[PDB]
């Protein structure tokens, strides 16, 4: 995610946020980053709220009849070209600052999607008759990408990155309340930048891909960025002994990450919402992952009554 960024949209582009009622969303297509919300069903308060959170939190978008399409993770993109990253570096950092103690807050990045959670929510979704897609690299990148090419209305996640990524429109709390609608357009005009200074504000309030200059905070983030566009012309004109930068920066590399991610084919892409195999996923939930099949039934009910 980006540090901050939810906080100052609220306090620059308040008109961007938009808090909206469910039952506003009937007959709309949004595209879910599944990663993301595996992870927030994991963290919610061996395990399986990986595939209740899933069922029921799917179940009722299709009550309100709104058609998700799921999108994961694909490997994780590389800044530079001699060193391999893994996803697993950041929930090492996650591991510093939670010993250092916000104690739950470390606690919950330390939390890892793993490969036995994915396959088995995909092989739920099946039964589901639900569709989903394997982005390349982030699926935040993959879920503003069929956005901007009118495959879905919005993309459904809590990472404020997917802004960033180039969404037009963010959906947040749908798998949670309110859904909180971000606006793109509405930020860009706001604050005077167009995408590829956005990309460099949110270099400098922080993101997963590098570091951000210490001592330059959001509200002088944002008039730096105003001012000189850039990152290059702002390192450029700032007192190296007031504010040294970091060392081995890799903001050139995290900005054409933004600019050009590693992205699915939108038009490759033909979503299709079927009808839930009711035989299938009583076996699957309640004879292998011990589910109560009264209340999968019940659930499965819900799900094919909602699309007829
Ligand atoms: C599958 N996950 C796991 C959680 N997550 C987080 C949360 C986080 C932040 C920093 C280190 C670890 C996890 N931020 C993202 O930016 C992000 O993309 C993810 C994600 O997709
Ligand atoms: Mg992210
Ligand atoms: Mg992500």
Redesign the pocket.
Known sequence: ?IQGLAKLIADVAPSAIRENDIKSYFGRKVAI?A??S??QFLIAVETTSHLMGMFYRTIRMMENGIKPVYVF?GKPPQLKSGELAK?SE??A??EKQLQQAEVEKFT????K?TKQHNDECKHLLSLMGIPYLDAPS???ASCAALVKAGKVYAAA?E?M?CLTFGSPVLMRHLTALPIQEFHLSRILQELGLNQEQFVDLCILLGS?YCESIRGIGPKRAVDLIQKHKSIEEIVRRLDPNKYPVPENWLHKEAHQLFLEPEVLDPESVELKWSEPNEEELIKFMCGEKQFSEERIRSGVKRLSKSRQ
């Open positions: 995610g980053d990663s993301m595996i992870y993770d996803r950041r929930r950092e996650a919950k990045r330390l939390v999607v982030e699926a935040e996640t990472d990155d997963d």
